[PDB]
Amino acid sequence: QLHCSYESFDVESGVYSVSSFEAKPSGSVVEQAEDTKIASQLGNCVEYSLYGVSGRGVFQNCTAVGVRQQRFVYDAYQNLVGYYSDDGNYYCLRACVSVPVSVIYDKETKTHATLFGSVACEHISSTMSQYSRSTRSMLKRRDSTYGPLQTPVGCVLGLVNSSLFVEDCKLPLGQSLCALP
Amino acid sequence: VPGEMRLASIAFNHPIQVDQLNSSYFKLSIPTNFSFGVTQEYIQTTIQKVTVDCKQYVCNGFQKCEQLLREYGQFCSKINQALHGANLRQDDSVRNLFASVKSSQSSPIIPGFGGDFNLTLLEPVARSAIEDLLFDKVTIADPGYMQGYDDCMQQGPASARDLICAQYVAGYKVLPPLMDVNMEAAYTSSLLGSIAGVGWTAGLSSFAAIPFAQSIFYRLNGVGITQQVLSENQKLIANKFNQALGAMQTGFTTTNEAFHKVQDAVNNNAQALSKLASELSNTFGAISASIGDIIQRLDPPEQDAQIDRLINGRLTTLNAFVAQQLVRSESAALSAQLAKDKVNECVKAQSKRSGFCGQGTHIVSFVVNAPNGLYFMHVGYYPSNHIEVVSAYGLCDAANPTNCIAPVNGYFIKTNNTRIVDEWSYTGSSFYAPEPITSLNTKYVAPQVTYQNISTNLPPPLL
Amino acid sequence: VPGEMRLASIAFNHPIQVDQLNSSYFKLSIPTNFSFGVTQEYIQTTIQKVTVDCKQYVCNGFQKCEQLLREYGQFCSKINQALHGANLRQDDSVRNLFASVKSSQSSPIIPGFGGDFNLTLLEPVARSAIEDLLFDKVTIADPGYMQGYDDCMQQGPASARDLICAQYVAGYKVLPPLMDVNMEAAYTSSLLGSIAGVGWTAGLSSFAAIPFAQSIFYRLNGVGITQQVLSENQKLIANKFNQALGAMQTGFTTTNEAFHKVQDAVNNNAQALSKLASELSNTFGAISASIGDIIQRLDPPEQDAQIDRLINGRLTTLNAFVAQQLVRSESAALSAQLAKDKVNECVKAQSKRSGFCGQGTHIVSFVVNAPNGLYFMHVGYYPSNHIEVVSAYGLCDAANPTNCIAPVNGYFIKTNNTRIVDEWSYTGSSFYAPEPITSLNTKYVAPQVTYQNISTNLPPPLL
Amino acid sequence: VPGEMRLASIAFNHPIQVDQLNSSYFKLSIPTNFSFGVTQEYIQTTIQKVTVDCKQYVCNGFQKCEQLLREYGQFCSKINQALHGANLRQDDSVRNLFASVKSSQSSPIIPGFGGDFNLTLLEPVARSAIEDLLFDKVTIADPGYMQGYDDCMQQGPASARDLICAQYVAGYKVLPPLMDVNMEAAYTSSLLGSIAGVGWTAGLSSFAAIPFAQSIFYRLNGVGITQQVLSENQKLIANKFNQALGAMQTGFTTTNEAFHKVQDAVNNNAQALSKLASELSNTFGAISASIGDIIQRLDPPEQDAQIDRLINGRLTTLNAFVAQQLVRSESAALSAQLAKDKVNECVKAQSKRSGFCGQGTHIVSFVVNAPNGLYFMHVGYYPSNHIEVVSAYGLCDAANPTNCIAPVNGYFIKTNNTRIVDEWSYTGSSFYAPEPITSLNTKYVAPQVTYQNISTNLPPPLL
Ligand SMILES: *[C@@H]1O[C@H](CO)[C@@H](O[C@@H]2O[C@H](CO)[C@@H](O)[C@H](O)[C@H]2NC(C)=O)[C@H](O)[C@H]1NC(C)=O
Ligand SMILES: *[C@@H]1O[C@H](CO)[C@@H](O[C@@H]2O[C@H](CO)[C@@H](O)[C@H](O)[C@H]2NC(C)=O)[C@H](O)[C@H]1NC(C)=O
Ligand SMILES: *[C@@H]1O[C@H](CO)[C@@H](O[C@@H]2O[C@H](CO)[C@@H](O)[C@H](O)[C@H]2NC(C)=O)[C@H](O)[C@H]1NC(C)=O
Ligand SMILES: *[C@@H]1O[C@H](CO)[C@@H](O[C@@H]2O[C@H](CO)[C@@H](O)[C@H](O)[C@H]2NC(C)=O)[C@H](O)[C@H]1NC(C)=O
Ligand SMILES: *[C@@H]1O[C@H](CO)[C@@H](O[C@@H]2O[C@H](CO)[C@@H](O)[C@H](O)[C@H]2NC(C)=O)[C@H](O)[C@H]1NC(C)=O
Ligand SMILES: *[C@@H]1O[C@H](CO)[C@@H](O[C@@H]2O[C@H](CO)[C@@H](O)[C@H](O)[C@H]2NC(C)=O)[C@H](O)[C@H]1NC(C)=O
Ligand SMILES: *[C@@H]1O[C@H](CO)[C@@H](O[C@@H]2O[C@H](CO)[C@@H](O)[C@H](O)[C@H]2NC(C)=O)[C@H](O)[C@H]1NC(C)=O
Ligand SMILES: *[C@@H]1O[C@H](CO)[C@@H](O[C@@H]2O[C@H](CO)[C@@H](O)[C@H](O)[C@H]2NC(C)=O)[C@H](O)[C@H]1NC(C)=O
Ligand SMILES: *[C@@H]1O[C@H](CO)[C@@H](O[C@@H]2O[C@H](CO)[C@@H](O)[C@H](O)[C@H]2NC(C)=O)[C@H](O)[C@H]1NC(C)=O
Ligand SMILES: *[C@@H]1O[C@H](CO)[C@@H](O[C@@H]2O[C@H](CO)[C@@H](O)[C@H](O)[C@H]2NC(C)=O)[C@H](O)[C@H]1NC(C)=O
Ligand SMILES: *[C@@H]1O[C@H](CO)[C@@H](O)[C@H](O)[C@H]1NC(C)=O
Ligand SMILES: *[C@@H]1O[C@H](CO)[C@@H](O)[C@H](O)[C@H]1NC(C)=O
Ligand SMILES: *[C@@H]1O[C@H](CO)[C@@H](O)[C@H](O)[C@H]1NC(C)=O
Ligand SMILES: *[C@@H]1O[C@H](CO)[C@@H](O)[C@H](O)[C@H]1NC(C)=O
Ligand SMILES: *[C@@H]1O[C@H](CO)[C@@H](O)[C@H](O)[C@H]1NC(C)=O
C-alpha cells in the first residue's frame, strides 16, 4: 500500500501510517417487542437493531441516565450513546474500536517491522480476525518465532529488546523509543 | 443588584518631567529604591501531531463505497503525504531546539541551591513544582498511549467522554511526542545548572562553577550598582528577590496573559480534531449521514449517486483540514526559532538589549516546560522613588587644564552627603548612593569646555 | 515625439580597490569628507478592524430567506466568532506595543529644541509637521464615527461616494481605532523627549537630561571621530545635519519606497472591503441579484430553490473573506513585533549593529505615526573622498622591547602633517585627521613581531 | 540477509559535572585541545517566477470556448494581476538584499590568498569550486532562455522530457532571474575581499586591508586565547583550519541537512508547475479532457454545457495555484530578511552572540550562491579535553588591603607549571595555558572578602 501511494519501487526510510484494522462484526442482537436467542449478548461488536434503529457496536451494563421512556440516549453529535432495554436495564453503547497501524521501513536493508499504536499486546495475536488487508506474512518470516512486544508507545512486531542506547536511529518511534536497523 | 456601567476616559500616565538646563551642569534623575519583579511569557514550539486514515474517514468498510472511492484514491494519497511531511517537520524543529539548549557542562543540582535565594524551581529529586502547576491548571484531556485504547473499550468507566477514544472510530491518530517528558526535564535541569554564571568573558568554553549568589552580585554590578552598596544590602537583596518569586504561586490564573496563551494553545489543538468529528454527521444533501443506512434503503442505481455526493464532501473537509495544519505547522516552526534565540540570549547570558524580557534591565531568567512549548520567567529590576540631583559632565584641574577626568559607569554629582568632605561625589547609574571620587571610578579624558574647573582638592590626580 | 527604447546593461559599481600588502605595515583607506543623510521605513502594525452583520449580508430581512437561512445559521455563528477573535488580537498587539514605547521620564518639549539643529518634528503646541504631510499625501477616505452615518443620509451633499457609507447598506462595520489620535501623539512626544541621551551606560534607570546637541557629539565620538575634530566643526556639523533633514519636505512622493508602502497599506484595506461589496450583485446562476425581485417573480416551489443557490454562494464569499482577514491579521502582528524591537534599539539607543537603519553606522533616529503603523527616519553617516595612507599595527621602544602600544579606536599612520614633528600620528577610525600620539589614545599591549621599532621619540612611555 | 530491527532507547548525553564549592576559591573547567570545525546552512531568498497565459490555459483558442470564456474574463484579469504583483515583490527582495551585501571597498582577490590557509573558495579566474559542486549535485533541469524554446522544437533530440518545453503547450512562462549569475558572483567576491578586516572598531568607514591570517589571529584573541599561545601554534592553527575546510569536499550528500534543504527548494518549484500540467487532463465530469474533441462529438446545445463545466474547474485550479504562490512568495521574503541580517552580522563581523552560526563561538564565516538563495558556511571553535583547576576570584596585597586586582578575559589559577615560580598564574578563557601575572592581564578593582590575601610576592603592584 505504501509503495502504491508514492508511485514507486523505492520508498524512503521512515515510519509510515497504513490503513487500520476495522472491527470484526459479531452476531446480531435485536430488541423489538410487538427470533431467539438474541435479546442480549454483552458483548464485543455485534450488529444490532432496536425498534428500527440500527448500527453496529458494543454494549455495556451501566448506570441510569435521564430520561427514561425516551428509550434512546444521544450525544451532541447525535451518536447513539445508550439504550433502555425492556429488561429494565440501562446499557451503554460505545460503537466499536479499531487498531491503528503503522510500519517501520528501513530502505537501506530493505527490511521492516510494525507498530499497532496504543492498542496493547493483550489484543494482539499471530493471525487476525478483523480485518485490514490480505496478508502480513513478510513480518511473519521472522515473527512466526516471536511473541508481540509491549512498548511505552505500543505493542510491536519484530522489534526485539536489545536495551541499547543510541543518539539517533533515524526511525524514532516517539518517546525515548528508537527503532535501530 | 449592581447599577449602570460608567463611561470613562482612558488614563494617560505622564512621564516624570525632568527640567532641561543649559550651561556646564545638568539635572539628573536617579532612583533610590529598587525592587525586583518578574514577567512571564509562553512561546509555543510545536503542533500536536495528527494523522488520518483517509480510507477509514471517508467510509467505514462498506464495500460499495470502497469501489466508488477508488476513483478518488489519489486524493487520499496526497492527503497522507502532506500530513506526513508536516509531522516530519515538527520532529525536526524539536531536535534542533534541544540540540542548542544543552550545555557541555553544568553544576550538579542539590537542595539548598542559591543560599538565601529560595529557588522553588529545583527538581523534587521529576518535573518541577512550577511545571506541575502549569500542567495541573491546564484543562487538557488525559493522554493516550498508556493504557490508551483500553480506555475506549468497555473495560473502563461509563463516564469517559474523551475525544481520544473517538480517534478509534474516526480513524484519527494522535502521534506521541518525540522526546519523552523525562528527557525534557533533564534538558532543562541542565540549563539550571549552567547558571552562575555566563560572565567572566564569553563563557562558551570555560565554566565558572561559582555559587548562584555570587553570579547575582556580578549581574547587579553589571547594571551600574556599585559594589559598596551590594555588600551592605546582601540580605535585603535576597529578600526582595524571594518576594518577587513568591508571587509565582498566585500567578497561574487566566488574568495572567502568559498563562492564558498556554491555555489557548491547548484549545486550538482540541478544536482542530473536533471539527473533523462533527463532519462525520454532516450530510451534503445526501439522504443520510450513515453509509450503511443509505445502502440499506436504496436501489443500487440511486445508491451509488448518493454515496458519491457524500464522498466528495468528506474529501473536501479533509483537504481543508490539511491546509489548516500546514499553516499552523509553519507558524510553530518560526515560533520555535524565537525560543531558540531566547535560550541563547536571555537564559544563557545577561542581556544588555532592553526590549526582550521584562522591562527592567536584565538579570537572570529561567525556563520551564509547558504544553507544546517553553515557558519563560524573567527576573527584572524596577526603579522607584526617583530624585533629581545636580551633576557635571566631568571635572578638570584648574591649575593644569590637561588633567581631566570623567566617571565610569556612573555620574559626578554635587555632594549631599555628610560623610564626604569633597565637593563632588560619585554615584552608580542604577542606584543612588554617593562615594568619594577615586581612580577606580574614573577615566582620563581629553579636556572639554563643559568640564568644571576645580580650584583645589581632587584625588585622581592628586596633583 | 519620443523615439525608440534603448537596450542597456545593468551597471555594476566596483568597490574601491585597496592594495594588499605584506610585511610589517599596511595600506589603509580612510574618508575625508563625511556627509549626513537619512533613510526611512514604514512598518505596519495593524489591520483595519472590520465586522460583518451576518443576518444582513446574506439577505436584507426578506422573510423567505430568513426561514431558509436558519438551516445555515451555524455558518454565520462561526463567521462572527472568527472575526471577533481577529479583532481582539489586533487590540492586544497595539497595547503591547505602546506599553514599551513609553518612557518613565522625559524632558519637556519646548520651541528652540536642539539649539542650531532645526528639528521640524516638534509638535505645533497636535500631531506634527511630518505626520501632517503623511496624512495629507495619503488618498484615504475621510473617516466616520463623527458625524459618520449622517453623511450617508440625505442631509448632506449629492457627491458623496464613500464606501464608508456603503457599510450601512451591506451590514459592514468598521470599528474605531483603539488608542485615539491624541494619545498616540502623546506617546511619540514622550519618545522625542527621551533623546539626549541613551548613553552614559544603562539608561534603563537614570535619565541624563542633557541638551540634544551634546548627545549628538557623544554619538559622533562613539563612531570613532575624535573629539578635537568635533569641537572645530560644530557649526559645520549642524549645517550638514539640517540639510539632511531638509530633504524630508520633498521626500513624500511615490518614488520614495517607504512612502509607497504607506500608500499600499491603505489600498489593501480598501480593496478588502470593496470585494464584499461587489459580490452583492454577483448572481450564482440565480435568476436575479435581488432577493426581493426574485421573490416577486416566482412561485414558491421554485422561489426557494433559487434563493438557496444565492445563499450558498454568499456564504462562500464570507468564508473566503474571513480566511483572508485571519492571514493578514497574523502578518500584522509579526510586523508589530519588529516595530517594537526597533523602538527599543534604534530609537532608544545608538546601535552598533549595522544592518538595521540606514547604511551609515548609526546616529539618532526618530519615529512618527503613519496610517496603520509607524514611520521611522534614520539619520546616518556617509563617508566620502577616501584616501589611502601608510599605517602600522603598533609601536614599540627599540631600546626596551617590552614597551609596546597600540591605538585605541583609531590607527597609527605615518605623518603627513606639517604641524606634527613626530614620525607617527594618531587618527580617528571614521574620519581622517592627524593628532600627536598620547596616552589618551593608546593602550599597552603584549609585544608582537609586526610592531615598528622606534629608535628615539615616543611620548607614551616617554622612556 | 539482515535480521530483526532492534528496539533501543534514545541516549541522553550527560553534561560534564563540575563540583560546586563554597569558600573563597572555586573549581574551574577549562579546555586543553581546541579543534576547528564547520557548520552550514541554506537560506532561501526567492521563489521561481511564473506567469500564466490564463486564456491559453483554460482553452486552446477553440472558438466555442472563447465565446463562453468571455463571461468569466474578469477571473483571468484577477489572476494575472495577482501573479504580476507577486513577481514584482520577488524582484524587490532581491535588489534590497544585494544593496546591502555590497561593500564600498575591498581587497583585490589573488591566488595564494590566506597564506598557509588553503582557501578553495577563490574564484577560478567565474563561479567558485564550491558553487560548482553545489550546482552539480543538484538535480534541477537545465534552464531555458538560451536556446530555450528551440529545445521544445523538433530541431533537437528525441529524448528531451523537459517540463520547460511543456511551458509552451500549457501557456506557462518561467521568467528569467533578475540579476544574471555573473553579477551575483561579483557580489560575493566583493564580500570575500572585505574580510581582513572587520575589527579595529567601526569598519563601517575605514578599511583595514590586512592579510587574512592576521585577521584570524585577532579573532582568536577576541575569544580569550592569549597572544602567547597564538604565536607558538601558528602552523598548527593553519593545519587544523585546513582540515575543517577540507571536509567540505565530502559534505555534499543528502545526509547533510543544509544540502537537503537546497534540494527540496528545487523540488518545491518543480512540483508547483507539475500540478498545473496534470490538471490539463483532469475532467470535471466533462465527457473529455480535450475541448476540440468534445466539440467534435457534440450538438451545440449540449456542447456548450459540457465546455462550461470544464472551464469552471480549470479556473478553480488556477485560483488555487495563485493562492499557493502568494503564500510562498511571502515566506521567501521573510527568509530573505533573515539572510540580510546574517550577512551584516555573521559575514561582515565576528559575532559575540552565541547560538547563531555553528555552536563554537564565532570566527570568520563565508557565503556562496545557491539555487534560489544563499548558502553559508561558518567556521567555529570546538573545545575538548577539559580539565579542572583551582581558581580564585581575585588577589590582594595582605600588607595593604586597598591593593586589589582581578584578571582580564581570563582567570587566576593556582600554578601547576614548573616554569613559573609565582604561586598564582594567569590563563586564557578559551584555552588552558599558564602565564605570569602582569599588569597587561589585570585590572584594579575595589576590595572584596573573597579575594585571596597574598603574604609576599605580587608583581602588579610590586608593592
Ligand atoms: C522601597 O520600595 C518597596 C517596594 O517593594 C517598599 O515596600 C512597600 O512599600 C509600600 C509603601 O506604602 C507598602 O504599601 C508595601 O506594603 C511595601 N511592601 C511591599 C512588599 O510592597 C518600601 O517601603 C520602600 N522603602 C524602603 C525604605 O524600603
Ligand atoms: C522557601 O523555602 C521554604 C523553606 O525554607 C519553603 O516554604 C514552605 O515549604 C513547605 C513545603 O512545600 C510548605 O509546606 C510551606 O507552606 C512553605 N511555607 C510557606 C509557603 O510559607 C519553600 O521551599 C519556599 N517557599 C517560598 C514561598 O518560596
Ligand atoms: C575651565 O577652564 C577652561 C580653561 O581653558 C575653560 O575652557 C575655555 O572656555 C571658554 C568659554 O567660552 C572657551 O571660549 C575657551 O575656548 C576654552 N579654552 C580652551 C583652551 O578651549 C572651561 O570653560 C572652564 N570651565 C567652565 C565651566 O567654565
Ligand atoms: C564634502 O562633501 C560635500 C557633499 O556632502 C560636497 O559638497 C558638494 O559637492 C558637489 C560636487 O559636485 C556640489 O555639486 C554640491 O553643490 C556641494 N554642496 C552641497 C551638496 O551642499 C564636497 O565634496 C565636500 N565639500 C567641501 C569639502 O566643502
Ligand atoms: C529651519 O527652521 C525654520 C524655522 O525654524 C524653517 O523656516 C520656516 O518653517 C516653517 C515651518 O517649518 C515653514 O512653513 C516655512 O516655509 C519655513 N520658511 C523658510 C524660509 O524655509 C525652515 O524651513 C527650516 N529649514 C530646514 C532645512 O529644516
Ligand atoms: C598630505 O599632505 C599634502 C600637503 O600637506 C597633501 O598634498 C595636497 O594634495 C591635494 C590633493 O589634490 C592637492 O590639491 C594639494 O595641492 C597638495 N598640497 C601640497 C602642498 O602639495 C596631501 O593630500 C596630504 N595627504 C596625503 C594622503 O598625501
Ligand atoms: C622590532 O624588534 C624586535 C626585536 O626586539 C623584532 O622581533 C623579532 O621577533 C620575532 C618573533 O616572531 C623573532 O623571530 C625575531 O628574531 C625578532 N627579531 C630580532 C631582530 O630579534 C621585531 O620584528 C622588530 N620589528 C620589525 C618591524 O622588524
Ligand atoms: C587534539 O585534538 C585533535 C582533534 O580531535 C586530535 O587529533 C585527532 O584525534 C583523532 C581522535 O580519534 C584521531 O583519530 C586523529 O588521528 C587525530 N589527528 C588528526 C590529524 O585528526 C589530537 O590527537 C588531540 N590531541 C590531544 C593531545 O588530545
Ligand atoms: C589545498 O591546497 C592544495 C594545494 O596546496 C589543493 O589540493 C589540490 O588541488 C588541485 C586542484 O583541484 C588538485 O588537482 C589536487 O589533486 C589537489 N591535491 C590534493 C592532495 O587534494 C587544494 O587547493 C586544497 N585541497 C584540499 C583537499 O583542501
Ligand atoms: C583577606 O583580607 C580581607 C581584608 O580586606 C578580608 O576581608 C574581610 O573579611 C571579614 C571577614 O568577616 C569581613 O568582616 C570584612 O568586611 C572583610 N573586609 C572587607 C573590606 O569587606 C578577607 O576575609 C581576607 N581573606 C582571607 C581568605 O583571609
Ligand atoms: C447491571 O445489570 C445487572 C444484571 O445483569 C443488575 O443486577 C445491576 O443492577 C446493573 N447495574 C447497575 C444498574 O448499576
Ligand atoms: C527490555 O529490557 C529491559 C532491560 O532492563 C527490561 O527492564 C525490560 O523488562 C525488558 N522488556 C520490556 C517488555 O521492556
Ligand atoms: C542658555 O545658555 C545660552 C548660552 O549662551 C544662553 O544664550 C541662553 O540664554 C540660556 N538660556 C536661558 C538663560 O534660558
Ligand atoms: C611578502 O613577503 C614574503 C616574505 O619573504 C615574500 O617572500 C613575498 O614575495 C612577499 N609578497 C609579495 C607580493 O611581494
Ligand atoms: C560552606 O560554607 C558554609 C558557610 O559557613 C558552611 O556553613 C558550610 O558548612 C560549608 N560547607 C558546605 C559543604 O556547604
Side-chain angles (χ1 to χ4, degrees), chain D residues 142-463:
Chain D
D142 288 346
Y145 296 138
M146 281 309 127
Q147 42 284 14
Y149 169 98
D150 288 317
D151 295 332
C152 192
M153 292 292 286
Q154 69 274 29
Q155 301 294 302
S159 66
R161 295 293 181 271
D162 292 345
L163 292 175
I164 292 169
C165 162
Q167 291 184 39
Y168 301 106
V169 177
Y172 304 151
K173 183 181 178 184
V174 175
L175 299 179
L178 181 59
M179 292 302 295
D180 178 351
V181 70
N182 288 340
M183 291 179 71
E184 291 174 345
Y187 280 110
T188 62
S189 71
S190 295
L191 287 172
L192 183 59
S194 70
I195 295 170
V198 302
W200 305 92
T201 69
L204 301 177
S205 59
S206 66
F207 181 64
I210 63 171
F212 176 83
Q214 293 301 319
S215 75
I216 293 299
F217 291 135
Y218 287 121
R219 289 188 184 86
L220 291 172
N221 188 238
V223 296
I225 299 170
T226 177
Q227 185 64 48
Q228 182 63 44
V229 170
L230 292 175
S231 68
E232 292 175 12
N233 290 325
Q234 292 176 70
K235 290 181 180 179
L236 181 59
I237 291 168
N239 287 339
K240 288 179 176 177
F241 185 98
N242 285 336
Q243 290 177 346
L245 269 295
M248 295 300 97
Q249 298 297 308
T250 63
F252 295 93
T253 67
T254 59
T255 64
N256 183 340
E257 181 178 351
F259 180 77
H260 184 72
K261 289 178 179 176
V262 172
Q263 185 64 43
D264 288 338
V266 172
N267 287 330
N268 286 339
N269 286 337
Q271 289 174 355
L273 290 173
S274 73
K275 180 176 178 179
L276 290 174
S278 69
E279 292 294 318
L280 292 173
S281 67
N282 186 20
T283 62
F284 299 105
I287 291 168
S288 176
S290 169
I291 292 169
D293 291 345
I294 205 165
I295 291 168
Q296 184 65 55
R297 295 176 67 191
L298 296 171
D299 289 347
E302 181 63 22
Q303 186 187 114
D304 295 355
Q306 290 291 315
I307 292 169
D308 186 71
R309 181 184 299 160
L310 182 58
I311 290 170
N312 287 334
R314 289 177 185 275
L315 289 172
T316 300
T317 296
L318 290 175
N319 288 337
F321 176 76
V322 171
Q324 187 65 49
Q325 290 295 314
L326 291 171
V327 171
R328 292 177 67 206
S329 180
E330 180 62 21
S331 70
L334 293 174
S335 182
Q337 183 62 47
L338 179 59
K340 183 179 179 183
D341 289 344
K342 287 183 174 180
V343 172
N344 289 312
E345 290 188 356
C346 183
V347 175
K348 293 179 185 174
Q350 185 175 30
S351 176
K352 304 297 184 181
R353 293 179 65 195
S354 160
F356 241 48
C357 299
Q359 305 296 290
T361 66
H362 184 249
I363 189 165
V364 67
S365 296
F366 304 96
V367 60
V368 299
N369 294 285
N372 299 311
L374 298 176
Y375 186 82
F376 294 83
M377 293 164 281
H378 303 285
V379 178
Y381 179 93
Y382 297 90
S384 75
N385 297 339
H386 298 282
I387 62 172
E388 296 175 341
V389 299
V390 174
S391 178
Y393 293 98
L395 301 171
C396 301
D397 185 353
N400 183 335
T402 63
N403 293 328
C404 292
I405 62 172
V408 178
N409 297 324
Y411 304 93
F412 290 147
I413 60 172
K414 181 72 180 176
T415 186
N416 190 72
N417 189 331
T418 60
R419 186 180 287 172
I420 301 171
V421 300
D422 291 346
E423 294 297 323
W424 296 91
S425 64
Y426 175 84
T427 184
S429 67
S430 65
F431 185 79
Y432 178 77
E435 291 177 350
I437 299 170
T438 186
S439 67
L440 293 174
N441 296 323
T442 67
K443 63 183 181 181
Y444 287 88
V445 298
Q448 184 172 289
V449 69
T450 63
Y451 294 167
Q452 300 296 305
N453 293 297
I454 299 172
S455 66
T456 57
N457 183 354
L458 177 65
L462 186 60
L463 303 178

Side-chain angles (χ1 to χ4, degrees), chain A residues 142 146 159-160 162 164-166 176-178 180-181, chain D residues 1-13:
Chain A
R142 299 295 192 192
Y146 304 106
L159 251 297
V160 179
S162 72
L164 295 175
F165 293 88
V166 62
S176 66
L177 297 179
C178 198
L180 288 171
Chain D
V1 300
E4 300 85 345
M5 300 295 285
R6 290 182 295 279
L7 188 66
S9 175
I10 297 168
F12 179 89
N13 184 297

Side-chain angles (χ1 to χ4, degrees), chain A residues 1 4-6 15-20 22 42-44 54 56 58-60 62-63 77-78 81 92 94-100 102 115 117-120 122-123 133 150-154 168 170 172-176, chain B residues 49 51-53 55-56 60-61 66 77 80-81 84 91 95 144-161 163 165 167-169 171-173 176-181 183 274 277-278 281 293:
Chain A
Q1 182 183 39
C4 291
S5 69
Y6 284 90
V15 177
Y16 297 92
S17 177
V18 299
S19 295
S20 62
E22 179 183 359
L42 323 157
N44 287 308
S54 65
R56 185 180 69 194
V58 66
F59 291 90
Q60 181 183 4
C62 41
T63 332
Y77 300 100
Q78 304 183 86
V81 173
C92 293
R94 298 171 182 271
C96 298
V97 299
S98 63
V99 179
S102 66
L115 169 64
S118 65
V119 70
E122 293 182 358
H123 302 285
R133 294 292 181 270
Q150 187 69 59
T151 74
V153 171
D168 186 353
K170 307 299 180 188
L173 301 179
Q175 298 295 326
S176 66
Chain B
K49 295 185 289 178
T51 66
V52 178
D53 181 339
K55 188 172 292 291
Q56 190 68 48
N60 300 282
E66 182 62 21
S77 294
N80 288 339
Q81 290 173 357
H84 183 66
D91 288 344
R95 291 188 292 169
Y145 296 138
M146 283 307 130
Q147 42 284 15
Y149 169 95
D150 289 319
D151 295 332
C152 192
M153 182 65 77
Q154 68 183 311
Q155 297 177 335
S159 66
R161 295 293 181 271
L163 292 175
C165 162
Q167 291 184 40
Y168 300 106
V169 177
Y172 304 151
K173 183 181 179 184
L178 181 59
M179 292 301 295
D180 176 349
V181 70
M183 291 179 71
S274 73
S278 69
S281 67
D293 291 345

Side-chain angles (χ1 to χ4, degrees), chain A residues 149-150 161 163:
Chain A
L149 174 65
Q150 187 69 59
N161 179 336
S163 296

Side-chain angles (χ1 to χ4, degrees), chain C residues 360-425:
Chain C
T361 66
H362 184 248
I363 189 165
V364 67
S365 296
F366 304 97
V367 60
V368 299
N369 294 285
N372 299 311
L374 298 176
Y375 185 83
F376 293 84
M377 293 163 281
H378 303 286
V379 178
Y381 177 95
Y382 298 90
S384 74
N385 296 337
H386 298 281
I387 62 171
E388 296 175 340
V389 299
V390 174
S391 178
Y393 293 98
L395 302 171
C396 307
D397 187 348
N400 183 335
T402 63
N403 293 327
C404 293
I405 61 172
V408 177
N409 196 19
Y411 303 94
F412 290 147
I413 60 172
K414 180 72 179 176
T415 185
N416 179 68
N417 188 333
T418 60
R419 185 181 286 174
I420 301 171
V421 300
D422 291 346
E423 294 297 324
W424 296 91
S425 64

Side-chain angles (χ1 to χ4, degrees), chain C residues 175-374:
Chain C
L175 299 179
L178 181 59
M179 294 299 295
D180 191 312
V181 73
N182 287 339
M183 291 177 71
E184 290 171 348
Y187 279 110
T188 63
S189 71
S190 295
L191 287 172
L192 183 59
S194 70
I195 297 168
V198 303
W200 306 89
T201 67
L204 300 177
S205 59
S206 66
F207 181 63
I210 62 171
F212 177 84
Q214 293 301 319
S215 74
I216 293 299
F217 291 139
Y218 287 120
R219 289 188 184 86
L220 291 173
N221 188 237
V223 296
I225 299 170
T226 177
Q227 186 64 47
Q228 182 63 44
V229 170
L230 292 175
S231 68
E232 292 175 12
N233 290 325
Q234 292 176 70
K235 290 180 180 179
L236 181 59
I237 291 168
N239 287 339
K240 289 179 176 177
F241 185 98
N242 285 336
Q243 290 176 350
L245 269 293
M248 291 303 296
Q249 298 298 309
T250 63
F252 297 112
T253 67
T254 59
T255 63
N256 181 296
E257 181 179 351
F259 182 78
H260 183 72
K261 289 177 179 177
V262 172
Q263 185 64 43
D264 288 338
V266 172
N267 287 330
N268 286 339
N269 287 337
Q271 289 174 356
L273 290 172
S274 72
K275 180 177 178 179
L276 290 174
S278 69
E279 291 294 318
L280 292 173
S281 67
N282 185 20
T283 62
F284 299 106
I287 291 168
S288 177
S290 169
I291 293 167
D293 291 345
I294 206 165
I295 291 168
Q296 185 65 55
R297 295 176 67 191
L298 295 171
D299 289 347
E302 180 62 22
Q303 186 187 114
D304 295 354
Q306 290 291 315
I307 292 169
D308 187 76
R309 182 183 299 160
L310 182 58
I311 290 170
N312 290 330
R314 288 177 185 275
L315 290 173
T316 300
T317 296
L318 290 175
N319 288 337
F321 176 77
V322 171
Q324 187 65 49
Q325 290 295 314
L326 291 171
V327 171
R328 291 177 67 206
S329 180
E330 181 62 21
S331 70
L334 293 174
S335 182
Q337 183 62 47
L338 179 59
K340 183 178 179 182
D341 289 344
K342 287 182 174 180
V343 172
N344 289 312
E345 291 188 1
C346 297
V347 175
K348 292 180 185 174
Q350 186 176 29
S351 176
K352 304 298 183 182
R353 183 181 289 108
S354 187
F356 294 19
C357 312
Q359 305 296 290
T361 66
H362 184 248
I363 189 165
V364 67
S365 296
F366 304 97
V367 60
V368 299
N369 294 285
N372 299 311
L374 298 176

